Amino acid sequence: FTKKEWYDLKAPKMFLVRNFGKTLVTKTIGKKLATDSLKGRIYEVNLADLNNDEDQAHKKIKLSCDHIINRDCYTDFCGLSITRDKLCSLIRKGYTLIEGHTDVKTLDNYHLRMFCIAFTKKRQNQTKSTCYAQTSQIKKIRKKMVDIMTAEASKVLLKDLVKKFIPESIGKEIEKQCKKIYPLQNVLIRKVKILKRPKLDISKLMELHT
Amino acid sequence: GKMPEGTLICNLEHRTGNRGTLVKASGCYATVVGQSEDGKKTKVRLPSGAKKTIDAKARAMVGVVGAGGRIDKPILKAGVAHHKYRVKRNCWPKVRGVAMNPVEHPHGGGNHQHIGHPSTVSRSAPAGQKVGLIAARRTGLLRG
Amino acid sequence: SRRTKKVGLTGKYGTRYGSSLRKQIKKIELMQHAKYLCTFCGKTATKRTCVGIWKCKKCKRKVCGGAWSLTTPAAVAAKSTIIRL
Amino acid sequence: RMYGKGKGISSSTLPYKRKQPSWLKQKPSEIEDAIIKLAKKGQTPSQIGATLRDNYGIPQVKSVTGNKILRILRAQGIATTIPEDLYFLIKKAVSMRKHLEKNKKDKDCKFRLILTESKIHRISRYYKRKKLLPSNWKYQSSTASALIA
Amino acid sequence: PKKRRNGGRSKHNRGHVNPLRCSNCGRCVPKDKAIKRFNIRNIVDTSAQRDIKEASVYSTFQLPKLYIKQCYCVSCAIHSRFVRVRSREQRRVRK
Amino acid sequence: SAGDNINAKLQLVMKSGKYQFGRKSCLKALRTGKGKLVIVSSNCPSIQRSVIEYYAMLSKCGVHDYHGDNNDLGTACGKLFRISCLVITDVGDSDIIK
Amino acid sequence: ELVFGVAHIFASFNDTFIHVTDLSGRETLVRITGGMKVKADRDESSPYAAMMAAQDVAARLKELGVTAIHIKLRASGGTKSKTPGPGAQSALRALARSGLKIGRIEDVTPIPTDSTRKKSGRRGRRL
RNA sequence: UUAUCCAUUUAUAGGGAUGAAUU
RNA sequence: AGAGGUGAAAUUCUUAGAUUUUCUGGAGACGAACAACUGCGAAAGCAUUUGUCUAAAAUACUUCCAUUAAUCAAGAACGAAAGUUAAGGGAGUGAAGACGAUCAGAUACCGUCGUAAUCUUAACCAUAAACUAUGCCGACUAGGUGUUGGAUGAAGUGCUUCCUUCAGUACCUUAUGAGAAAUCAAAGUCUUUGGGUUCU
RNA sequence: UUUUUUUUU
């Protein structure tokens, strides 16, 4: 209505724009606080608009408003998702699909679950219409990829996890090590979700956001 | 208000301090189906199928009352019913009111053993009138 | 040999009561008294002790349970959900 | 195949050379002096030939010595009373029943138990027809576990 | 009269195939018998695609497609003016 | 395969190496160190279990807690009773050590 | 000062919902539907109602202040249907024609890994 | 919450991070 | 201030805020897209992940037994769905039923709701267009295109392709083969009539 | 969206 006021939104310092838009906040009257109504809400942004490049248009980031100072909402990473339209664009007949998922533990005691798509590579000399994979190598590669993902996520924090998600650095070494077992086409991480986040530590967010 | 929603509880305390008031019959349980955002209030579903709002400080046992399914086996004979009610009350045997004399029961009397008047009595009926189906909203077989 | 072809334990009831009623307690007689398995000893020898009280033949330690079973399908599920947390 | 479908011609084709090959300078004496040695260690005759031909490199024991392998385990009283095939079938049946004892919903598995029980019964009948298997021997399923000996 | 050699389905070395539901009528059809079309569409026809292009931003935004993979029952497929009844002799050739 | 390692290794050491079964056998072997490897039952009370595991790291013997009540090593090995505690005297050509 | 909102278009072979909210999804700004305009109990999904239900929200958005908007397209649900109704084309057309700034586009029709069986039995719809 | 009403007890410890244990 | 719904309509929900947006939980259900004239199983049937138990098949063997084989009345195991019994569960669908429209009538097709059922367990029931309508074992008779799991030789870069060959597995053409024909590489090798066997 | 019917040789 005529009373609702705009609140600018902010992104963590790692992203180069640090600002994508403004939200709307209703009447700040009575006992209802117009600070927790703004707080604990989800903003769904696209990496393409958030980094001013068209390369990162196939995935999107969810930012949860963790805390508010003055008026600018600072938000924080809470979930990652790729666009299902790009997922189904990637999906095609003749190539077997592989899924992976696990629960990881960061040094910040952050509970993260990530799901990963995996395709197979036609290469050059196959001379066949199909690129199916015998289920034993699917077994093996799913186990090995889950193991390596857990290993890489156990000894790192959440913020550097985002630092490595941005250049899709997770989708390269897996292809590198699968080249010696079974060639895989373009793969990636589909969705990452926060299961249980520790108590909100205000001291650990200022030096990251600023 | 400490346990998550969806858990099964027994020996409910419908008001903080009654040291056990609700959900106490054998095989009965309630399910916590919601917690208020600000705490201090939760919703539970009782074995009767009704939702009740109780403060979060109320206590309860987590689990299901023992000796479950007691009503499953059929009481074979009058003897088991006699022994059952002998340690409970004087509610047995019943004796139909239509088999009594008209002095002792509004159903009684007549040459054909019939009620004669509608058996759905009002909620405002006095002590000697509240004898049939008390303030019945409907009658007959249910359809779900 | 085999005296009762189908009636089994309900032979103590003779011809009294309904056939379907005796057969409905035939769903429960084979398990109210049956030797089920205890979880503190390991012999399939538990016996009915009361309406809710239960006991095997080794432990001499009673357990609250179902009316005529050591565990009830509701109570195993309820325990499983609690354990999962 | 006795049960199911599929021909499955995979097998071992013995060579035409009835005698020992020219390179087989290893004498039949010490060739015979290598089978009971591995036998009383505890080893099935179906694998004794395999280990002889893999490590000692002495295939066709019948060709190298004018006697069969079970003949040269049987001439000296070291052969088991229950034949190898029957023993390997009753161990399979014992595992079958140990599994089905706790897992009673495994209906395909108990169908396979029926199949192997029929196999055991007919093979035991055949071995009974020969004098090497006692006529009193019955293969009661209850004592199948102890029948391994 | 054994109209088709395959009997109208592509089932071989199988006893049962889990079925699916037709999109337009909901009729339960076996998966190998249903007429399946992986439909690729434009959410906007090119005439208005030019409009959204000129009213959009980034100066290079490209239209993402729609991926349906619809299924039809046989009874409704021929009424949907897609499946040809065609001829007996040329019935055999598929592609 | 994971539990097959324990099951098959035990079954094979029974036949190859010398073996014994019983809580009395275990106490007799583990009051001298003869019992090479010692197993404690999950079902058995912790009072039973923790003294038997106590014996192991005085004896420098490997103790493992078998999840179960009465099975396999008490049913499949040679016996039909509730074993509730296991120990091995001697080892043959078995990799049970690791 | 450029500002971004998100508009959800819902096409289900009936009234085309237009639901314009901020970029959080929360705190809706204007909801217009398709049946808000035609009183004939018809053309709810038709471009007739669909595109005239969009220049009005364009004007409302103009007087509110927000200019740049993303779009999320919805085709019924996970059981009812999968293709957007006739109203989506006209909804896009009117937003394009109004001069309203259009940003990124996405389809968020709920796709079930589940297979909860739909209306009608095995025989299916007979009409 | 002070009128008023209800519940509990021996009116028995201010808010946040199958063994015992009294002088 | 509408929303569901329909060829229309109506029943129904909706100022106590329906539909719609987002987040959080709970419940039961299913396991799409991958997913195929592809795999496994005696058939019925069997698709999220991982673990355990158990089996089966093919391949390779210069491992072993040596006829231990095939088909089988009786007799047995399993046997879709629906249904019965009894508990638990009950989201969605939904025989019965309740309404609302069409119709001359509509007890039906269409719409809304809706009990049993569908789901789990423990027992029964033993039937399906349980269908490739084609019983099982064995020998032989033709080319090509595929494809699944091995095995062999060679060659694009330890990796990966082509040749050959087994066990499946379908498809196209051909029959001086068959059939009444449709069609069949078996439904052929049958008046040039007899490989063995069970059922009808 | 609806469309029932047509003695006997």
Coordinates of C-alpha atoms (C1' of nucleotides) in Angstrom, one line a residue, chain H residues 2-13:
Chain H
rU2 C1' -6.1 -6.5 42.5
rA3 C1' -11.9 -8.5 42.5
rU4 C1' -13.3 -13.3 41.4
rC5 C1' -12.7 -18.5 39.7
rC6 C1' -9.7 -23.1 38.7
rA7 C1' -5.5 -26.7 39.2
rU8 C1' -0.9 -28.8 42.1
rU9 C1' 2.0 -29.8 46.3
rU10 C1' 5.9 -31.3 51.5
rA11 C1' 2.6 -24.6 48.7
rU12 C1' 10.6 -27.2 48.8
rA13 C1' 16.1 -24.3 44.5

